[PDB]
């Protein structure tokens, strides 16, 4: 139970009838296992790789619960590493895929401007 999930469920695109392939189901499954392990931080480079080639985490047309769940944990993680970065900078060029995905999800779910990660562009 979270505010972010509640707001996602209030959107129309929430109710679309996506049918996962085995590969998609495997992908949603592995991200929930990472969430359950509490190890999203070690898996951020994997996340960035997924997002390099996929707009949303489970290769969908619209964001799914996987996106929201991973986003809720990843957001504070990412804005910490931006704030603790030695090279503004390199962090941005490297993790740009998580950053564009963060920017989509935070705006979709109407995250407060105070809690929002400011994207440079």
């Amino acid at each position: 139970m979270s505010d972010l999930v509640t707001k996602f469920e209030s959107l129309i695109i929430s109710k679309y009838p996506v049918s996962f392939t085995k590969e998609q189901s495997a992908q949603a499954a592995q991200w929930e296992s990472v969430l359950k392990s509490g190890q999203i931080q070690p898996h951020l480079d994997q996340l960035n790789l997924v997002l390099r080639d996929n707009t949303f985490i489970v290769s969908t047309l619209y964001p799914t619960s996987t996106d929201v769940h991973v986003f809720e944990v990843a957001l504070p993680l990412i804005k910490d590493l931006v704030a603790s970065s030695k090279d503004v900078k390199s962090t941005y060029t490297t993790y740009r895929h998580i950053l564009r995905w963060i920017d989509y999800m935070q705006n979709l779910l109407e995250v407060s401007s105070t809690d929002k990660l400011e994207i440079n562009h």
């Binding site: 390099r52 995905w101 979709l108």
Partner: protein, 177 residues
Amino acid sequence: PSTLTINGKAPIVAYAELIAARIVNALAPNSIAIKLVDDKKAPAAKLDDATEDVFNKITSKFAAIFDNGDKEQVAKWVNLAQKELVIKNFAKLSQSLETLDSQLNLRTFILGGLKYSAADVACWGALRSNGMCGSIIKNKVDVNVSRWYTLLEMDPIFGEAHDFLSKSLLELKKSAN
């Protein structure tokens, strides 16, 4: 109700224009009658009377539907699509595609909204017309372009546009037979 006539024998098939029409008709049924011809002397695309600037003519006619993106900003990308992304020359196309890829670094859509704009339609359609872009997109050389292109392809309005064209050419043959 306007009429958009698409030519199946155009060296550059008017996918952007077709998709624009499909967007309009999905949101506003019976707005545009889509017709196919299959003749090398026919224009690639024709909206009622007009053979020039058809894409912009559709987007400007249906202003409520095509409401997003600063119009000057939209035009930058519509112009890149129409004059650069349709070019079947790897050396030119590579430069053009890097401009698009760079724009997409931190964006899901070309102009950075939560939803696609006419800019996305024009560029996607231009790339779909360009047989050369197939291997480029498939091989993910421009990772952002491939990520973006494969997103819109999943939307039937875009991804089944070719199916519509092929079926309509089938029906054109059938009516002749």
